[PDB]
Design a protein around this nucleic acid. Structure first.
Ligand SMILES: [K+]
Ligand SMILES: [K+]
Ligand SMILES: [K+]
Ligand SMILES: [K+]
Ligand SMILES: [K+]
Ligand SMILES: [K+]
Ligand SMILES: [K+]
Ligand SMILES: [Mg+2]
Ligand SMILES: [Mg+2]
Ligand SMILES: [Mg+2]
Ligand SMILES: [Mg+2]
Ligand SMILES: [Mg+2]
Ligand SMILES: [Mg+2]
Ligand SMILES: [Mg+2]
Ligand SMILES: [Mg+2]
Ligand SMILES: [Mg+2]
Ligand SMILES: [Mg+2]
Ligand SMILES: [Mg+2]
Ligand SMILES: [Mg+2]
Ligand SMILES: [Mg+2]
Ligand SMILES: [Mg+2]
Ligand SMILES: [Mg+2]
Ligand SMILES: [Mg+2]
Ligand SMILES: [Mg+2]
Ligand SMILES: [Mg+2]
Ligand SMILES: [Mg+2]
Ligand SMILES: [Mg+2]
Ligand SMILES: [Mg+2]
Ligand SMILES: [Mg+2]
Ligand SMILES: [Mg+2]
Ligand SMILES: [Mg+2]
Ligand SMILES: [Mg+2]
Ligand SMILES: [Mg+2]
Ligand SMILES: [Mg+2]
Ligand SMILES: [Mg+2]
Ligand SMILES: [Mg+2]
Ligand SMILES: [Mg+2]
Ligand SMILES: [Mg+2]
Ligand SMILES: [Mg+2]
Ligand SMILES: [Mg+2]
Ligand SMILES: [Mg+2]
Lengths: 122, 203, 50, 117, 151
RNA sequence: AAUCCCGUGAACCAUCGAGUCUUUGAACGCAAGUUGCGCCCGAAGCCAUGGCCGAGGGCACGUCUGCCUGGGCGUCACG
RNA sequence: GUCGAUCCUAAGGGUCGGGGGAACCCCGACAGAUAGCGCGUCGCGCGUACUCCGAAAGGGAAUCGGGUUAAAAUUCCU
RNA sequence: GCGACCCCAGGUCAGGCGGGAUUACCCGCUGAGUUUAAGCAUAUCAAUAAGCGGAGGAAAAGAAACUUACAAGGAUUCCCCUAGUAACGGCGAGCGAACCGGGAACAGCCCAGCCUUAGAAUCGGGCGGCUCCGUCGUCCGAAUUGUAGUCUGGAGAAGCGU
């Protein structure tokens, strides 16, 4: 009957484009009917077809993005669109390892004289 | 250990050797723009005791600042006010020429962090400083535990908030006790605290 | 005037669209307080200022 | 030796960009395809008279579409050749295109296929 | 840039040069410089590739169950230490160190320590001996016994 | 509206992690009372290596590291 | 494509570098390795620091009759 | 002429950084007058408003070139008190802190310089692998006009042994 998203994800890339082409052509006819005094029932189909086009485009874009992220997986430099967004300030932060770097004497102090667990007898 | 010889030589600024070298350098600086990148510090011994390290990420710039006081920037030297405020000349800027040199470099070099600066030369018209700046984004700096503190956001534009070595001097923070107590934690913070009218619940 | 920029003509087009009565079915909604269009503009009474 | 007293900056080699990563992962989708360009035909009485009097089809088109793209959109959409295209921006901010077909094609026949007549 | 560097050269010779700076114009003679530099080439420090090559020969030697090298000493900080400790037998100073304050005092230190010194032309030439772009000065703590007469 | 009801499932529902996100604006090819005036790359398609066509993108300034191409007898060395 | 804007420059405006300035800002090609162009096929030659903005009355490539609408035309039709 | 180095220039060269917005609190600069003095000029209003900049969840300050004169306290900040006090002031109008003491909290540290010279032991980038905020290998660079270690006065280096 209507478009089911989980069924779209099982289609191939060519099929999605073919279905997208058909949906746009169908929507064009409905637009003509809207200006030629089309029946009220046919005018309600515009909303349904608009939803279908968006769903097909969403599936196509999601598959395309997913494949691209796999191609650049384990690469040093990624396209800016695929890099994490987060916030500007968070991206400029020192990494976790860098923030914890210390001089050799500071390292030795931690090993030689760390805080000890102790208690006072009552 | 050669730095002590260099440092002690620079303590004799009125000797013939230093007067000649400074005279030639002073001419050379006058012909170049007011802010110039230098390949290496003119005073490596002085630079490294202020934090400079000969590694990628550290850069040195020479800054030229005009000498003298601060004429009040008022049109035609006219002040609309009582005589106590009618002075126009013989007025002095509260910040020092060293601070101005750091600010000039900091504003121009927005992508770098100002670390410190030092005097290198002067004439009757201009005063010359070298400003040490750090590229906080460079990996060598970010992996160095002794300098990577400057990569943190709290240290943005230290020179424009008076947080450099020169900044502490003109804020009155070089010193403590009865002669400098009003300067901490800040002069305006001290004023606001002392002006506060504390109205407790049970009073 | 007849000589007009694209930007100005676009702004004038939007103002014309906004200068209409409210749909009648708006006043029949549940908990409706919109009585009429309070931002109606007449070319001769109030000027657009640009 | 130099025969010119004016010093000129010597020519130096310039390389073309060879980025290690693309700034955009993939090209953007076409936002002005045939369906986007041709929104819907105009079915006003004035527009209808031009179907037979002038063999012209009146379309409402995307404001960002130029005559070159309108001509190609009509070719792909209805498989017809155009003699000339005249465009104007209506007072409501939309763009109208007067599309005159060549004598080899009949606008009235094409209009029936569209479904306006 | 060209104009300033040419005016800089002129200005230096127009003004009176104090003796401490004028002593650097009296560089070693060309004929003797070649002989000195030829000897230095026989005591070049090992290269990066050569340095790695010996360290792998030692690792295998350590797994399978020796002489002190004789090479030129470079680095102003290290040379100054050798001069003060009186372990330097010859100090070679570049005449074109900028800033000159780095080495303007070296001749006085060598004279006070009774260590022979020479001023040669080219810090780049000295650097090439030690596989560096430039070298302010070079030092020889001891030469090989086979050529202690010409030295 | 044979859109949806013992359910891949209604909702002007809640929530968010996938995805889309026009023209602008610090606004960045140059401009602007202009949808004005440039240059470069280029998928797909198509006509016989070239030609047309063209989705889409790129070209601001300062600055750091590295790199390439250069200038000056600035300091030298060797022919 | 033919009417204009668009192009050109005017009084002038906005600017690089440089010089000032705590900074907002000031001066404005004046402290300077210009822009590039031409001809061959990447090389030679030339090369005086703005390829900027600034006119719907200045300068300026090209459209004329006849017909046509309730309302458009030197723009639609012939 | 061929090379090294130096300084500088060009690049849509490879990969990065910066601008702007927000106002309650925070940091720096700049800076009035109304007003009060029963007039008014110093003063006061005020080291304030307005102006120009820069940050963070806090900021700033901070491990004594201090307080004190005692039987001595011991980085900074904050609260109470000191106190409307010492002091300043046409000694007029007015103005005005600090130490001690009691509490909230509590934390200390890193460099520069003589000291690897039997080995720049340091770091970045390109490429590759892995257990991928990193690590290993290799290559090209940075750096001797000095990277990394050791040391920071409370110490410390060196030698000796517990
Ligand atoms: K005033
Ligand atoms: K007064
Ligand atoms: K223009
Ligand atoms: K004109
Ligand atoms: K004229
Ligand atoms: K005609
Ligand atoms: K590596
Ligand atoms: Mg460097
Ligand atoms: Mg009127
Ligand atoms: Mg108004
Ligand atoms: Mg038109
Ligand atoms: Mg722009
Ligand atoms: Mg535009
Ligand atoms: Mg004309
Ligand atoms: Mg003019
Ligand atoms: Mg201006
Ligand atoms: Mg400028
Ligand atoms: Mg000129
Ligand atoms: Mg020129
Ligand atoms: Mg022009
Ligand atoms: Mg113009
Ligand atoms: Mg005209
Ligand atoms: Mg008319
Ligand atoms: Mg690039
Ligand atoms: Mg009064
Ligand atoms: Mg009164
Ligand atoms: Mg009065
Ligand atoms: Mg204010
Ligand atoms: Mg800001
Ligand atoms: Mg924030
Ligand atoms: Mg807190
Ligand atoms: Mg802080
Ligand atoms: Mg201390
Ligand atoms: Mg205390
Ligand atoms: Mg009392
Ligand atoms: Mg007061
Ligand atoms: Mg206090
Ligand atoms: Mg207390
Ligand atoms: Mg060391
Ligand atoms: Mg020890
Ligand atoms: Mg010890």
């Amino acid at each position: 009957a209507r478009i089911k998203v989980h069924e779209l994800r099982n289609k191939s890339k060519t099929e999605l484009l073919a279905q997208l082409k058909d949906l746009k052509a169908e929507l064009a006819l409905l637009r003509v009917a809207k200006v030629t005094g089309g029946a009220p029932n046919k005018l309600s189909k515009i909303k349904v077809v608009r939803l279908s086009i968006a769903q097909v485009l969403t599936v196509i874009s999601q598959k395309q993005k997913a494949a691209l992220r796999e191609v650049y997986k384990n690469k040093k430099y990624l396209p800016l669109d695929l890099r994490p967004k987060k916030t500007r300030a968070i991206r400029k932060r020192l990494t976790k390892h860098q923030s914890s770097l210390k001089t050799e004497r500071e390292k030795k102090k931690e090993m030689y004289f760390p805080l000890r667990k102790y208690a006072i007898k009552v | 250990g050669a730095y002590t010889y260099v440092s002690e030589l620079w303590r004799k600024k009125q000797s013939d050797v230093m007067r000649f070298l400074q005279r030639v350098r002073c001419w050379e600086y006058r012909q170049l723009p007011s802010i110039v990148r230098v390949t290496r510090p003119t005073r490596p011994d002085k630079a490294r005791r202020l934090g400079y390290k000969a590694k990628q990420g550290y850069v040195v710039y020479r800054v030229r600042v005009k000498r003298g006081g601060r004429k009040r920037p008022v049109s035609k030297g006219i002040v609309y006010g009582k005589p106590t405020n009618q002075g126009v000349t013989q007025l002095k800027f509260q910040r020092s020429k060293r601070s101005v040199a750091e600010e000039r470099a900091g504003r121009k070099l927005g992508g770098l962090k100002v670390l410190n600066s030092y005097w290198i030369n002067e004439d009757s018209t201009y005063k010359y400083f070298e400003v040490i700046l750090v590229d906080q984004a460079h990996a060598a700096i970010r992996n160095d535990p002794r300098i990577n503190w400057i990569c943190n956001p709290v240290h943005k534009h230290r020179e424009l908030r008076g947080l450099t070595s020169a900044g502490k001097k003109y804020r009155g923070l070089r010193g403590r006790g009865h002669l400098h107590h009003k300067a901490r934690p800040s002069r305006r913070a001290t004023w606001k605290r002392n002006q506060t009218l504390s109205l407790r619940r049970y009073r | 005037p007849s000589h007009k920029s694209f930007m100005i003509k676009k702004k004038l087009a939007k103002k014309q669209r906004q200068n209409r009565p409210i749909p009648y079915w708006i006043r029949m909604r549940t908990d409706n307080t919109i009585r009429y269009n309070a931002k109606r503009r007449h070319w001769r009474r109030t000027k657009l200022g640009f | 030796i130099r025969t010119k007293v004016t010093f000129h900056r010597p020519k130096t080699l310039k390389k073309d960009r060879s980025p290690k990563y693309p700034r955009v992962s993939a090209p953007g989708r076409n936002r002005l395809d045939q369906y986007a360009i041709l929104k819907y035909p105009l079915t006003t009485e004035s527009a209808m008279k031009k179907i037979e009097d002038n063999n012209t089809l009146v379309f409402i088109v995307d404001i960002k579409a130029d005559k070159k793209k309108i001509k190609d959109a009509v070719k792909k959409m209805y498989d017809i050749q155009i003699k000339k295209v005249n465009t104007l921006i209506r007072p409501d901010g939309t763009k109208k295109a007067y599309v005159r077909l060549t004598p080899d094609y009949d606008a009235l026949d094409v209009a029936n296929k569209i479904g306006i007549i | 840039n060209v104009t300033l560097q040419r005016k800089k050269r002129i200005l230096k010779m127009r003004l009176k040069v104090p003796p401490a700076l004028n002593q650097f114009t009296k560089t070693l003679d060309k004929n003797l410089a070649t002989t000195l530099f030829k000897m230095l080439l026989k005591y070049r420090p090992e290269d990066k590739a050569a340095k790695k090559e010996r360290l792998v020969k030692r690792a295998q030697a350590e797994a399978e169950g020796t002489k002190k090298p004789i090479i030129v000493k470079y680095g102003l900080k290290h040379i100054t230490y050798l001069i003060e400790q009186n372990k330097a037998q010859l100090v070679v100073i570049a005449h074109d160190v900028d800033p000159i304050e780095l080495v303007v005092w070296l001749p006085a230190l060598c004279r006070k320590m009774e260590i022979p010194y020479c001023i040669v032309k080219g810090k780049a030439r000295l650097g090439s001996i030690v596989h560096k772009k430039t070298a302010s000065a070079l030092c020889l703590t001891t030469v090989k016994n086979e050529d202690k007469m010409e030295f």
